[PDB]
Structure formats: C-alpha cells, structure tokens
Amino acid sequence: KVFGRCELAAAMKRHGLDNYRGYSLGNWVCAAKFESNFNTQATNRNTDGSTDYGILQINSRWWCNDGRTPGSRNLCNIPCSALLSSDITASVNCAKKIVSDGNGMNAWVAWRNRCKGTDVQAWIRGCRL
Numbered sequence: 001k002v003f004g005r006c007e008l009a010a011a012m013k014r015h016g017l018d019n020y021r022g023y024s025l026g027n028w029v030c031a032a033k034f035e036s037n038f039n040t041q042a043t044n045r046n047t048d049g050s051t052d053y054g055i056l057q058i059n060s061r062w063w064c065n066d067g068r069t070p071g072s073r074n075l076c077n078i079p080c081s082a083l084l085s086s087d088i089t090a091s092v093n094c095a096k097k098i099v100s101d102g103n104g105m106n107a108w109v110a111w112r113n114r115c116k117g118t119d120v121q122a123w124i125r126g127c128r129l
C-alpha cells in the first residue's frame with residue numbers, strides 16, 4: 001500500500017508516534033517519505049547481507065527475522081514480512097523500540113541526513129489531525 005501523506009500522518013498519530021521519545025509527528029512522516037516513499041512494500045538489501053523492510057525500512061540485523069541474516073537478532077519478535085503489511089501497526093511498534101535504543105532517530109540514516117534539523121512540521125501541513 002502507498003499511503004497518502006496525511007493518511008500516513010493520521011495512522012502514525014493514532015499509533016502514538018507524535019512526540020514519541022520527543023520526536024514530533026513530522027519527523028516520522030519525513031523519515032517515511034525518504035525511506036519508502038510511503039510504500040509499505042518497500043525493501044532494500046544492505047551490503048552486509050541484511051535487508052530493510054517496510055514504510056520505515058526496518059533492518060533485519062537487529063529488529064526482525066527473515067531467516068537469512070546470519071548472526072542477527074529479532075528484538076521486535078516479528079517476521080520481517082510483517083513489516084510489509086498495509087496495516088502499519090507492526091512497523092510503528094518496532095520503530096518505538098528502535099528509537100529507544102540510545103541514538104534516537106539517528107538510527108535512520110535518512111532521517112539524520114534529510115530530516116534532522118529541517119522544518120519537519122511541513123510534512124503534516126494541511127492534515128486534519
């Protein structure tokens with residue numbers, strides 16, 4: 001599923017992401033735009049053999065199991081495929097663990113490089129929230 005911008009903002013807000021670990025909602029929408037283009041089925045293979053899954057491109061080295069990332073963890077206790085669903089519940093709940101890992105949203109390289117320090121409120125402009 002490819003979310004509309006405000007459609008995603010709404011779903012993220014309902015799942016408690018607005019100011020989760022102090023990151024306002026626009027951060028998460030920004031991250032999702034550059035990570036997945038709002039597409040829940042996005043995947044990317046990493047050079048270390050791990051794979052990123054879903055709307056927030058969550059990685060198999062630590063957070064989900066795909067059975068093909070040797071020596072990896074599954075700290076969100078989910079199959080990575082769950083991160084590709086049209087329902088973003090699994091992605092949001094896993095993201096909450098990632099962002100609590102110590103480095104905040106810097107865990108997402110795209111957020112650090114393209115959202116951090118920008119006017120992220122623009123990503124929820126026009127949205128009925």
Ligand code: NA
Binds near residue numbers: 034044057110
């Ligand atoms: Na990415």
